[PDB]
């Protein structure tokens, strides 16, 4: 214990102020294998659940939380602070800290703790109010010599990882909640790291809080510092109090540990139950059985406020990612400086009425590869951090979805500015300035469109790879409908449906009928079909799919669940 | 906010001395309480902290005075005490009584010669 | 973390503009206080977070930061500024305090 660091501040600076937590769990009977599980645990003790401390895809701590996306047959009781459990208190009273990080790596540490804190406290605190907390949050748990220090994981600079999790820690104790329960919380950290954090969620524990904490092979060091321990193996509990007493406790029933022997491990390895036989499988089981029965015998703040901060953060977390944003303008300066020199205009033979059509054609269905591809992956880069803020209650889903597309905005009209204006002049196109404007507001509301279809399909469907799959379906099948490549008339009765909901085969219509009418003529556009519909009707077909696919992304927000 | 220190006086090496910090204006049971001295020609040295009722009264101490120094609170008077055993030998200072360690240090005493 | 405060002495009459200056060993992000110290020995905070004022103290101070250097800057001095200044950290324990400058009018 001498070889750690001894010289810290033992202070405690934000300490609970209330009543008592209590969390009880009667006869829990968990199946789909926990077998009467039963504790009480009160403020002010620190739990830590050693052995098993899963049942397959759901841990014990989000059994007992009440999550879980596996079978839950429920036979026992669960009471948190002398009442039943629910999702509303639960949400109300228990704050958890899972074992992977999703913290936006362009922000520093002061400024997603306010973030967090102005979208999690009342709207009655004052702004000074709010600080305050952070401060308070930022001196608890050491985080002062990283206030300006920016929490960008891996790929990034950013901090340690032992201050990365002091940092969601403090995010999940920003609205000083009674009771916490950390799952593997020194996963992926150095021996002295997880043994200041285990000190430092000791402090929390005392400092009249209730910590749970999930540890499935706890190290010798880390063992030391447990305040109470629960030996769990097959799902059945073996010990249930202090850790100190613990080989005490068994060395009275004829189980003594030897010296120089960690002895978590060494009981966890004794009454664990053998796999790779099948006369030791029973052999173990009847052994944790009689120690178990040993055991059991022996004992505000609002929605516009939310939208705000949600785009303030998100604006400030995309507009410091430097190399994405040199990516995607690399990529759209790429594809314009292609498409214009590939259809150069500005020479001794100029480009014919085919040749225009195709560039048109080519400038419209060239983009939604690289958009549909850049919005399912930064989508799928933050499902967790979305689905976790979502579950806890940060947001009610209604401000997500503004904020996501007023913070996508910007950069989607640049890349739209920087793949369409430079490429106007370069194909020598028809000049003037109304037609201009007129071809940029049709692109930039095309790509808008295909922006939302790709948010929509991302998030309705779990993985990035069938996401993508049915993304590029969709953008083939409205690439095949266009009025380019099977003439937009040899469609019996789908197709031609699919033309009139495709974006592509407006775009190009709409940019026909800006290029060709009344320039040397309507009649080409009479020889095809691209004259049954003015250009504002072209353009409030767009708007009016755009809204069909904001309105499918919402209810793909609203109704299905984010799970990573 | 007022804080008066009392106490200070000649005392042979190897004695006991006690100083008294007087306070006003506020909850003497809510924050930290740290006596901070100064040596004659060097600069500001922080001494020993006594937190609030939150931490249950628990006390701290420098490197240097770990050991010899015991600093604690009278709640009903509202009085911070520092015992010091085996001074004069360093310890001549003009310790000041100071509120708040970690969140700045605010509302200083006026300081007491030993 | 050890308080380098410059300089250790400095002499500036009335309406002058004085600069005391103070480098941390490492960073405190900001966490950075100073204080005024005067003849008679009644301490008070002047500073506190290096950009913040306290209640009841002449505008006159103020904090600024230049990379990893504290700047404490008291434009239009009067003849109540003839006193000892100190810059300290509370980022890290224990908190440390600086040489300290007497500035003398």
């Known amino acids: 214990d001498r070889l750690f660091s001894s010289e810290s501040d033992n202070s405690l600076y934000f300490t609970y102020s209330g009543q008592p937590n209590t969390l009880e769990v009667r006869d829990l009977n968990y199946q789909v294998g926990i077998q009467n599980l039963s504790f009480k645990v009160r403020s002010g003790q620190m739990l830590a659940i050693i052995g098993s401390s899963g049942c397959g895809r759901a841990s014990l701590l989000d059994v007992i939380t009440g999550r879980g996306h596996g079978g839950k047959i429920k036979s026992g009781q669960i009471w948190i602070n002398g009442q039943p459990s629910s999702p509303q208190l639960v949400r109300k009273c228990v704050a958890h800290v899972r074992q992977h990080n999703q913290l936006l790596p362009n922000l520093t540490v002061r400024e997603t703790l306010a973030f967090i804190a102005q979208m999690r406290l009342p709207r009655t605190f004052s702004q000074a109010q709010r600080d305050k907390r952070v401060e308070d949050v930022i001196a608890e748990l050491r985080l002062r010599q990283c206030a300006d220090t920016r929490v960008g994981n891996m790929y990034v600079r950013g901090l340690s990882g032992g201050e990365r999790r002091r940092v969601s820690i403090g995010v999940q104790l920003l609205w000083n909640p009674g009771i916490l329960i950390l799952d593997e919380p020194t996963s992926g950290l150095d021996s002295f790291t997880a043994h200041n954090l285990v000190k430092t969620l000791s402090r929390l524990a005392k400092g009249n809080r209730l910590v749970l904490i999930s540890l499935h092979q706890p190290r010798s060091d880390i063992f030391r510092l447990f305040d109470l321990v629960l030996l769990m193996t097959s799902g059945t509990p073996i010990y249930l109090g202090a850790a100190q007493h613990m080989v005490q406790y068994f060395t009275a029933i004829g189980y003594p540990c030897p010296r120089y022997s960690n002895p978590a491990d060494f009981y966890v390895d004794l009454t664990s139950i053998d796999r790779r036989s099948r006369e030791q499988e029973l052999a173990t089981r009847e052994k944790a059985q009689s120690l178990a029965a040993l055991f059991l015998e022996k004992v505000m703040p609002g929605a516009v406020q939310q939208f705000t901060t949600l785009i303030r953060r998100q604006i400030s977390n995309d507009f410091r990612d430097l190399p994405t944003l040199l990516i995607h303008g690399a990529e759209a300066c790429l594809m314009s400086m292609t498409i214009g020199f590939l259809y150069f205009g500005h020479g001794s033979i100029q480009l014919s009425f085919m040749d225009t059509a195709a560039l048109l054609f080519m400038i419209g269905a060239l983009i939604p590869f690289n958009v549909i591809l850049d919005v399912i992956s930064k989508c799928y880069s933050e499902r967790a951090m979305l689905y976790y803020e979502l579950e806890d209650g940060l947001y009610t889903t209604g401000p997500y979805f503004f904020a996501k597309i007023l913070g996508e905005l910007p950069e989607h009209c640049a890349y739209i500015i920087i793949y369409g204006m430079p490429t106007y002049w370069l194909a020598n196109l028809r000049p003037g300035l109304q037609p201009f404007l007129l071809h940029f507001l049709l692109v930039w509301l095309v790509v808008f469109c295909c922006r939302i279809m790709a948010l929509a399909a991302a998030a309705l469907l779990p993985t990035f790879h069938m996401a993508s799959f049915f993304s590029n379906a969709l953008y083939n099948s409205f690439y095949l409908a266009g009025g380019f490549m099977i003439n937009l008339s040899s469609l019996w009765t789908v197709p031609a449906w699919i033309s009139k909901v495709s974006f592509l085969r407006w775009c190009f219509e709409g940019l026909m009928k800006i290029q060709f009418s009344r320039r040397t003529g309507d009649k080409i556009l009479s020889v095809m079909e691209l004259d049954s519909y003015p250009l504002y009707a072209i353009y409030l077909i767009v708007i009016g799919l755009s809204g069909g696919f904001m309105v499918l992304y919402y209810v793909s927000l609203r109704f299905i669940k984010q799970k990573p | 906010v007022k804080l008066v220190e009392s106490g200070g006086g000649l005392v042979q090496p190897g004695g006991s001395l006690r100083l008294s910090c007087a306070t006003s204006?506020?909850?003497?049971?809510?924050?930290?309480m740290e006596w901070v001295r100064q040596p004659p020609g060097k600069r500001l040295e922080w001494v020993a902290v006594?937190?609030?009722?939150?931490?249950?009264?628990?006390?701290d101490y420098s490197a240097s005075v770990k050991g010899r120094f015991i600093v604690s609170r009278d709640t009903s008077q509202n009085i911070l005490y520092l015992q010091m055993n085996a001074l004069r030998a360093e310890d001549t200072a003009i310790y000041y009584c100071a509120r708040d360690a970690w969140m700045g240090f605010d509302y200083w005493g006026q300081g007491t010669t030993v | 973390i050890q308080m380098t405060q410059s300089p250790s002495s400095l002499s500036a009459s009335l309406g002058e503009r004085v600069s005391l200056t103070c480098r941390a060993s490492?960073?405190?992000?900001?966490?950075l206080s100073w204080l005024q110290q005067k003849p008679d020995g009644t301490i008070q905070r002047l500073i506190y977070?290096?950009?913040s004022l306290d209640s009841g103290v002449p505008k006159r101070f103020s904090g600024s930061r230049s990379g990893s250097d504290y700047s404490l800057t008291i434009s239009s001095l009067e003849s109540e500024d003839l006193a000892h200044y100190y810059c300290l950290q509370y980022a890290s324990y224990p908190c440390t305090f600086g040489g300290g400058t007497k500035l003398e009018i």
């Open positions: 977070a290096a950009f």
């Open positions: 204006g506020f909850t003497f049971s809510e924050f930290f």
């Open positions: 006594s937190r609030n009722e939150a931490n249950d009264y628990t006390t």
């Open positions: 490492q960073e405190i992000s900001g966490y």
